[PDB]
C-alpha cells in the first residue's frame, strides 16, 4: 500500500502510501478522585500492626500534603513554526474549576453516578469521571479502626487491602511530583484502557475518528496530556486533555533530502545543494499541512499521526517540488553550499546514498554479503535486497518494511548551474533566489565586459 | 500585576510585570543512609516465611551491588552560550569524599545526631544529614532471625515491616540506575518534603530567599541534582546540589518577535524582518541577563526562575531596542529574509499574529465564535476577549492569564528599507550591519551611476 | 593519563590523553517469559483473602492485556549527519519472530534449558535465555486455589508469594507502556546484572571487548534498547539491542573551541572568528571519526563511548588543524561574524575564556579568592590553581579532572585578516572560503583602481 519514487535530479524521495490523521483540536475531561481527612486521628502503639497501619497512614498523608504542595503552582511545560501553549485548554479547565462553588456542584453530581456530564462555570460542558473509591473504603472500614476508641487492628489482611485499594493514588501522586503535575504520555495508571475507551465512547467525535483513536490508543495516550487541577475539600480533579482529530483519511506524503554534489576530481571547488523540505507532507483542506519536525509526527502502520500545532500552512502547489523543480507555480527551497561531505539517509522502503570524494560504499546483505557498489553521485537502492548499507566510516541498517519503490531516471539540478557564480552561503534560500542571484552575478561581469 | 506593551513598528511585545529569581551559586549537602552487611548469612529453608525473607534479603543485596556498580563511573550529564558542568560542585564534593578517612569521619560526626556540620578534608564545611535508619532495624530486629542459630520467621509482620522500612532505598537505587547516578529533578524519595524545608532552614542564605526557596520547592527540585557519591563501609552518602539565589526581586520582562514582511501582492520579492533575541530579559546588578533558551527558565505565577549558566551578559542600554531600534546606544539584532511564511507567537496576555498572503487568520471566541479577521500585516489582540486564535490550518489556543495589554501603534521599520538593495541572507546581523550593507551597495550603484 | 594543549592562535584545545571505544554494530538477543492463561477462572468470594487473590489476578490481567494492546503497533523511536534508524535490527528481528512457528520453535528450544542458541527463520542465530518463570508458579501452586472446585485461600502467605514472584512483570509492562514498546536505557528489571554479564559471555566478542563491557555495563545499558517483539500463546518474547564494540583502544581528542574577536576599542567594527569543529576525534582505521553531538558520545574514566551511527568519516588529515590552519593537506572549517559577545567554555583540563568589550573575567579559587584577572584576548587557565571562573554575570565551576596541561603562544589567527574586506555573514565556511572571498573583493577593488 505504500509506494516510494526516487528522483535522481534533486536526489530526493517521497512515500505517498500514507494516510493521515490529524490533530486539530484538544478535548478536555476532569477525572475525579475521592479522599478522606483523617489528618485528624493519631492512632498510635506498640503493636506491629498498629505500627504498620501508622506508617501507610503516614505515607497516603504525604501523598496527599505533597499533591496540596502543587495547589500553589502554575502549570506550565524550523525557525518559521512559532510558539504556543499545548496545555492552555486544560490550565483554562482548570481556572474554570478553581472558583468557589465548582467543586461542591461537581460532587453534587458525582455524587449518584460514576460518569456524568457536568455544566462548568464558564459555560462549557465537560465530561466527568469518578475512577477510585478511596473514601468508601476508608470511612467505612478503616474510619473505626484508626478511631481512638480501639486503635487496634485485627489482622494484616487490613493493611494489605488498605495498600491494595491504594498504590494507585502513590504512583499518581509521584508521576504528578516528577513531572511537575503536567504528565505526558498519560499513563495507565491515569486513566486505565477501559477509562480510556469509555470516555472516548461518549466523545462527540463521529465513528470513524473513534474507531481510529480505539486502534490507536498508545498514540492517543502520547498525544494527551493529564494537569492537576484542584485539590480542596475531599476531592482531588485532574485534567485530560485527550486529542481531537478533525482530519482522517486523506493523502499524506514524506520527503527525504539528501545533498547532491558535482562529480569534480578536485578537493575544493566542489558546488553542491540540498532541499530543505523535509519532513510530512499532510493535506486536509484544499491545502498542504507542513510537519518539519519529524519527532512530531507517529507512524503506525500506513497511518501517520501529526500535530497541527507544529505545522506550516502551504499551498496545492507544493506537490509540484517533487516533479518539476523549475515549475513557475511554487517556488521550491534549496540550499546551497560546497562542502563535499559523505552522507546517507535512510528511507522507509529504501535508503538514499550520496558518498563523494574518497569515501567508500557498500550495500552490504546478511547473506550474500556486498552486492552493490556507488561511484560519486546519488544513488538510490530499495531494501528488497540490500539489509544494511555502509557509508565509509558508518554502518546503517535498512528498514524492511513491505512495499513498492520506483525509480525516476534524470540529469542532476546542479549540472546546470555554472560553479563560477555559484553562490555558496545559502541556508534557507529558494530557486528563485539562486537564479536571482546568479542573474545578477552574470549581467554583472557582462555589463564589465561591454564597458571594458 | 503584569503589563503587556505591543509595538507595531517591530512586531514584538514585552511583559514587564515578572520577578526575578536568578540561580547565581550552588549549594551541596551530603545525605547518608546506613546500610547492614548480611551478605555473609545464607539463611534459608523450605518455609514460606524463610521463602520470603530470603527474597527480599536477595533484592536488598541486588539493590546494595547495583549500587556498587555506580562506584566506578565517574558522573557527568544561543550559539554563543557557551557550555558548563552543572554538577562540577557536585562531583568536587564527590571526589572530596572519596579521600581515606572522610568515610569514617562522616560515621563519627553523625553517630550522635542526624543533621550536623561536618568540616571536609578540603576545607569546605557542607550540611550533612541522615535520612533512614535501615541498620537499626535490620541488625537489631532482623539479624538475630537471619543468623543460621534460628534461620525461622514467626510472622509475616516482619517481611511487611522491612517491606515498608525499605521500598525506599529500593525506589533510591532504582532511580540511581535510571538516571545513571545523576537524577534531576530531585524526587521526593530522595529529599522529602520535611527534610526539604530543614535543610533550607540552616543554609547560609538570608530570610527573603528561604521564604522564595520555601514557598517554591517545586522549583527548587527542578533546579537541584543528586549525584551518587561514595557507597562504601556501612553508608551510603549522596549529594543534592541545591540552588542558590542571589538576585531576588528585580525586575524582568520577557520579549517575543513575530516576522513581519511587506504587504505586496506579488507571490515573490516579499521582504521580511524579525528580531533574533527572544527570551527573558533580567536585570541584577546594572546589566541585563539575557536567557535565549525559554526552556531553562520556569515561570511561577508573576516570578520568573532563571539559571545563570545558560545566560549571555548585555548592557542595560538593551532597554532601548524595544522603543527606538535606531538610537545610537546599542545595536538592536535582526534577521532579513523574504519567505513570506504565515505565522502567530502566543504571548502571555495575548497573542502576536502575522498572517501573509492567501492566508486566513481569524480570533474565534468560546461563545460569539469569530470575533476579529485580521488583514495582511502584524497584529495583536489582548486574550480578554479573545479565546483561541487560528492561522490558516492551525488552531492555538490564547493563555488566559489576567493582566492589562498595551498597543503602541506606529509604522513597521520595513516600510522604511528598499527593497532592491534589501539584502535577504543574514541570520543573526544587526540594525547596523543591515544599513552598512544597504549603504555599500547604494554607494556602488552611486559610484556607477557618476562613472557613467 | 590526559593531556591537554591550548592554542592561542585558534583559540582552540585539545585532549588527547583518552582511549576510544565506538559502536560499530548491534547485537540481537531474544528474552523470553512464561505466561499462564487464568483468564478462564473467576474465583470470587466475600473472603478478604479471595478478593485480595482476585485483585492481584486482575492487576495481572491488565497488565497481561496491556502488553497485547501493544501488539497492533510498528516500534519506532551537525546538519550532514544525516537519518538513520538504530532499532532496525531490532524491529527485524521482531518481524522474523512474526512468522507462524517461530513461537513454537522457542518454546520447544527453551522448554529443557534456561538459556540456548536459536536459529531464526530467517537464517540468522540469536541467543535466547528465559528470565522469569511465571507458569511454573501459577499453574502448580496457584491454579487449584483458583480453580472453582475450591476458590478459597488459606494463607496471606500465597498472594505474597505472588505479589513477589511478580512485582517484575509489572514493571516490565509499566515500563514498557510508558516507553511504547521502545525503552533505553534497559533497566535491571528487563536485564538483571548477571543475566547481562552471562549474555555478555556468549557474545562472540573478543576477550578485550568482553572485559572492557564488563567493567562499563552502565555504559551498555545507556547505549541499549528493548523491543516489544511477540506476545503470543502463553510466552512474552522482547529483544534486546546491545551495542558491538569493534574499535578498541585506539587515539581519541575532544576539541573545543571559542570565538576570537579583535581588540579594538570601537563598540562596533571588531571583527570575529570561530571554529565550527567542536566534538571528539576518533581514529579507527586510517581515518577519523567526528562526533558533532556530544551529548551522543559518553566519557568515562580516560575512555569515551560513541555512536558510529551519528558521526562523520573525515581524512586523517584532519589533524593538521591543530597546529597548521593554513596547511594546504586540509581545509580547517570557521565561522565568521563580528558579534562582540563575552562567553567561556569549560574544558576537561582546564577552562577557555573569552569576554570582549565592557565585561569583567575573574578566575576565582576556593581558598584565595580572586587569583587571576582577564584582559581582552583569548586567554586559558588550568585547573590545578582556579576553581571556578567568572565571566561577567555567570559564575562558572572547573571541572577538578587530575592530568597535565599546555600553553601554545601564538599570533591570533584575526590579526592577520583586514576587518575591510573581511566577510562576517559565513556560518559553515572554511579557511579557503573566506581567503578566496577576501581574494576576490581584494581584487574588484584593485581592478577598480586600475580602471580610475
Known sequence: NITEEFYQSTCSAVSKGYLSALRTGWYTSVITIELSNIKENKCNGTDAKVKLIKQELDKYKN?????????????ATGFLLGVGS??????????????????????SALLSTNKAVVSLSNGVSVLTSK????????????????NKQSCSISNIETVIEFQQ????????????????????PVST??????????????????????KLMSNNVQIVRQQSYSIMSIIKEEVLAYVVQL??????????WKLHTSPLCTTNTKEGSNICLTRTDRGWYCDNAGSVSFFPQAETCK??????????????????????????????????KIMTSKTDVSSSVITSLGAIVSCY??????????????????????????????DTVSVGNTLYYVNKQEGKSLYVKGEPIINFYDPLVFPSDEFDASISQVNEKINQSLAFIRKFDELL
Chains 1, 2, 3 share one sequence.
Open 189 to 210: 495508571y491515569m486513566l486505565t484502557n477501559s477509562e480510556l475507551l469509555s470516555l472516548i465512547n461518549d466523545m462527540p467525535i463521529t465513528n470513524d475518528q473513534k
Open 299 to 332: 507512524v503506525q502502520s500506513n497511518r501517520v499521526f501529526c500535530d497541527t500545532m507544529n505545522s506550516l500552512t502551504l499551498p496545492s502547489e507544493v506537490n509540484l517540488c517533487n516533479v518539476d523543480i523549475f515549475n513557475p507555480k511554487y517556488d521550491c
Open 357 to 386: 570524494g574518497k569515501t567508500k560504499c557498500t550495500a552490504s546483505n546478511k547473506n550474500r554479503g556486498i552486492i552493490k557498489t556507488f561511484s560519486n553521485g546519488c544513488d538510490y537502492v530499495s531494501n528488497k535486497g540490500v
Open 131 to 146: 475512577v477510585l473509591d478511596l473514601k468508601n473504603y476508608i470511612d467505612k472500614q478503616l474510619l473505626p479502626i484508626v
Open 86 to 107: 499545548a496545555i492552555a485548554s486544560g490550565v483554562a479547565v482548570s481556572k474554570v474549576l478553581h472558583l468557589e462553588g465548582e467543586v461542591n456542584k461537581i460532587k
Open 165 to 184: 485499594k491504594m498504590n494507585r493514588f502513590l504512583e499518581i501522586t509521584r508521576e504528578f511530583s516528577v513531572n511537575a503535575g503536567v504528565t505526558t
Open 63 to 75: 501523598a496527599v500534603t505533597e499533591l496540596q504542595l502543587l495547589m500553589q503552582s502554575t502549570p
Open 243 to 252: 486529542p481531537l482529530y478533525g482530519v482522517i483519511d486523506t493523502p499524506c
